[PDB]
Amino acid sequence: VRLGPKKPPARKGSMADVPANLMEQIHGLETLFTVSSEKMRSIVKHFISELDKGLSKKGGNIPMIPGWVVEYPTGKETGDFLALDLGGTNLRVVLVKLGGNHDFDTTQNKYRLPDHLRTGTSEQLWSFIAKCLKEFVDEWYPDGVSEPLPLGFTFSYPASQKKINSGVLQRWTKGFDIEGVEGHDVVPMLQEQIEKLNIPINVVALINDTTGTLVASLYTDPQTKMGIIIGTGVNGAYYDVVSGIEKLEGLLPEDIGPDSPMAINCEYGSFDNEHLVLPRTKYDVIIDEESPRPGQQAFEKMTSGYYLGEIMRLVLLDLYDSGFIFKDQDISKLKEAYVMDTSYPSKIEDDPFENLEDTDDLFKTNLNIETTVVERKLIRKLAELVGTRAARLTVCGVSAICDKRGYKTAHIAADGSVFNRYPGYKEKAAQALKDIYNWDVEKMEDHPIQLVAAEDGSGVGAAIIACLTQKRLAAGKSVGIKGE
Amino acid sequence: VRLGPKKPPARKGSMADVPANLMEQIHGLETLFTVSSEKMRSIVKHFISELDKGLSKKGGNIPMIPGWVVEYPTGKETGDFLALDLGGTNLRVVLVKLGGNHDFDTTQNKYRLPDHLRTGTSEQLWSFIAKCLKEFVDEWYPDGVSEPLPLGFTFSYPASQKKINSGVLQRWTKGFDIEGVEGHDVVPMLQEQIEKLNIPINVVALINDTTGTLVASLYTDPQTKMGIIIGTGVNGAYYDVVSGIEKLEGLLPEDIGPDSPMAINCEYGSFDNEHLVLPRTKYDVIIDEESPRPGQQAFEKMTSGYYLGEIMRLVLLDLYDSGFIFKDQDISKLKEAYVMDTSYPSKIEDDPFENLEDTDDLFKTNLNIETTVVERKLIRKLAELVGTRAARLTVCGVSAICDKRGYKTAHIAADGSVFNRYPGYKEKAAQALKDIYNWDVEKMEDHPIQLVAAEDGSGVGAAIIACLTQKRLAAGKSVGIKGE
């Protein structure tokens, strides 16, 4: 039925019928968008320097935020832990029972926030969350608990913390506008409503979701060396060592000593805001100039899935202006910024046909543009270049973290819409790693450093970080700066 | 992010808070929609009697159509062969190179049919298809070929054939309405257009796609015993033996002997149109009575994914009318036939939350109905019952074919949107085979009869049947009834 259920083979992609003038333009696009293996190596050297610089006292464009997880999960932890994952529209409550053999069981609910909460009072927001937590606990522990359930709170809003059981909101985003919260620690605000309702929970950790991706995945997969999100936003987290963090010198208690692990939330979207190494094209420059913050987020702009259609849009417009393509078409829909989302390069890269009929129907239907087959062949080459460049640049952050820490082998626990859904992304990223290291290895499943699907960072990961944190808190081991 | 990239585990699905009166209706639904293994076995006995009846001279509700493939592919076939698949919106052209080691390579194009084709003239249709084939051959064979390319034509319209290289259209479907084709053999009509354009192709076979699914999958997977489609429509194909086909007695040449294999396209959607054996409910009766052809396609109506939402819509409306659910809601959407497509039970079965928030959002957003959590638990149970009943009744068809032919081990090469995408469908069907055979086996890979993904029947399958047929035609071996 249709093409049958199995993944169609890649199209042959003959260029024999493409006229010389378009072939010249395609080869021009290859020089603008191709990232050489040696170029990746060059970017990784700079990236390692900038990781180091973000951990220094002077700091750098990469935040390199300490995540206050100062131990590795062993996979042998047991017990019941909660996670709260607060988004802009919904929250999720997860009960994780850790089985102590790299395994876990989950029970989870999701609650839609009423639309007035976002602009309501502080107390009503924390009240709503505590009400959801009471309803969930009352059901799953109808006879109560012997000890309070430790909870890990994924709060992925700009926030700072001097210890793991704290989060001082810096500024509301994802929609919110509530008074009396910016500049305050949210952990006591949530805990106060929890205690007001006599719910047996202690909020012991506040985290970024990518730190949670790292930790949940290392609990299940002991080869895990990094958590990476490759989607609309981008981020990476990994464990560095305290002796490598100059900006914490003089701030730590003796029980977070120089050889302690320390999870880092890199927030590396701002890598190369100086615009030195990343291969920004005139199209990337336009994107940046037209973005909400020109000059910010350089690495994110170069690797996020959000921009991949817009790159194509601007290139196609440039080709149309130069008189090469769409000569007798009405291209008005193409002039709309972001009209081409990530589905465009994805559907074009997935097209299994030599005549590129999926790509034909996509342009005719969505943009009112008729194409010749050789135009579609240029379009398909361009989509391939854009998806492949994004993968090759994302793996530079992977290779920089691995080389910084001396990981010769690693599983890189990955999540995000580009990793999970972009066509051929896993193949592109594996070939990119192989190109960087020049490995003599036949199959991608045998690569020394390889991306694998992550465990749930904002749910499971927050619950396992709560476990690790409660173990320290109970023993009186520090999980923050001296005195905090 | 979200719930992380891996399939969430199944929800716990506690029924502890469901009031007694609603819990009685839930258990009533479970009794009504569960198909016991004892009932599966009984259905299979009647299904086998009906397969035998369809092959008899007097015939029966199951067509049991001889497919005129009278040999098994060995996997040693080599060479270049074409397939054409004509659907209602497009046609697909496929070049299949057979490697001689159960292996093949494909090169394919897809041509969208001009708007006017479906209602234009026969000449317009066959001339369009020939033009597409000319453009395709002229490209992949620019210096021509040393022998004409044999072509398999997947023409999945009601048609009769007295030999494989023929198809006399009975009735257009899929929106076609072309004068001067019904009651005529379409093979010479296509061949004439190919010859007018001097394209080096011989149309050697016309097939139903399910016959293609059987043969392509047996070429690649020597354990294949059946091809099965579980989608919007349902069908199954397998090899019987000529001595087992009474309705061909007296009609065959000596070289299609009593021991020859014969592929059968069952068209078993009409099994039990008498409505005596399948466990219909009043809801299935309403679906049949309200359908375009009441009393037809009984087995299709009980196993196709097309009706799974509509079964739920009717059950839910019945429970509302009875006063049990949605009291005080505006249920007018529930009153629209086919408002609930297959995505409803699919999304509901995938909902990972104990409070069924995905199901809550689906009902509010799409149906304008607010639910209590206990209503959603009834809705979820109903979706599981409906998907599970469909899987177990499809497995009765599989088990009837295996038991008819004495297959105690088999790969069942499966395709269609239900098999490929319906949540948990592969585990539902594997459990159903274990139940009917009462196998003492823990792991699915140890199951002696298993559904596996099919190879492409309408492309690769048609091309492989062209290959088998060409070898016979060249040698003078028959592929049809005497004299045809």
Curated annotation (Swiss-Prot), chains A, B:
Residues 20-467 form the Hexokinase domain. One of its GO terms (biological process) is glycolytic process. Pfam families: Hexokinase_1, Hexokinase_2. Keywords: Allosteric enzyme, ATP-binding, Glycolysis, Kinase, Nucleotide-binding, Phosphoprotein, Transferase. The keyword Phosphoprotein applies. It catalyses: a D-hexose + ATP = a D-hexose 6-phosphate + ADP + H(+); D-fructose + ATP = D-fructose 6-phosphate + ADP + H(+); D-glucose + ATP = D-glucose 6-phosphate + ADP + H(+). One of its GO terms (molecular function) is ATP binding. Pathway: Carbohydrate metabolism; hexose metabolism; Carbohydrate degradation; glycolysis; D-glyceraldehyde 3-phosphate and glycerone phosphate from D-glucose: step 1/4. CDD domains: ASKHA_NBD_HK1-2_fungi (cd24087). The keyword Cytoplasm does not apply. The modification Phosphoserine is found at S14. Residues 208-456 are annotated as: Hexokinase large subdomain. Residues 74-207 are annotated as: Hexokinase small subdomain. InterPro entries: ATPase_NBD (IPR043129), Hexokinase (IPR001312), Hexokinase_BS (IPR019807), Hexokinase_C (IPR022673), Hexokinase_N (IPR022672). Residues 150-176 are annotated as: Glucose-binding. ATP binds at K110. Its EC number is 2.7.1.1. One of its GO terms (cellular component) is mitochondrion. Belongs to the hexokinase family. Monomer and homodimer. The monomeric form is active, the homodimeric form inactive. Catalyzes the phosphorylation of hexose, such as D-glucose and D-fructose, to hexose 6-phosphate (D-glucose 6-phosphate and D-fructose 6-phosphate, respectively). Has higher affinity for D-glucose. Mediates the initial step of glycolysis by catalyzing phosphorylation of D-glucose to D-glucose 6-phosphate. PANTHER family: HEXOKINASE, HEXOKINASE TYPE 1-RELATED. This is Hexokinase. It comes from Kluyveromyces lactis (strain ATCC 8585 / CBS 2359 / DSM 70799 / NBRC 1267 / NRRL Y-1140 / WM37). The lineage of its organism: Eukaryota, Fungi, Dikarya, Ascomycota, Saccharomycotina.
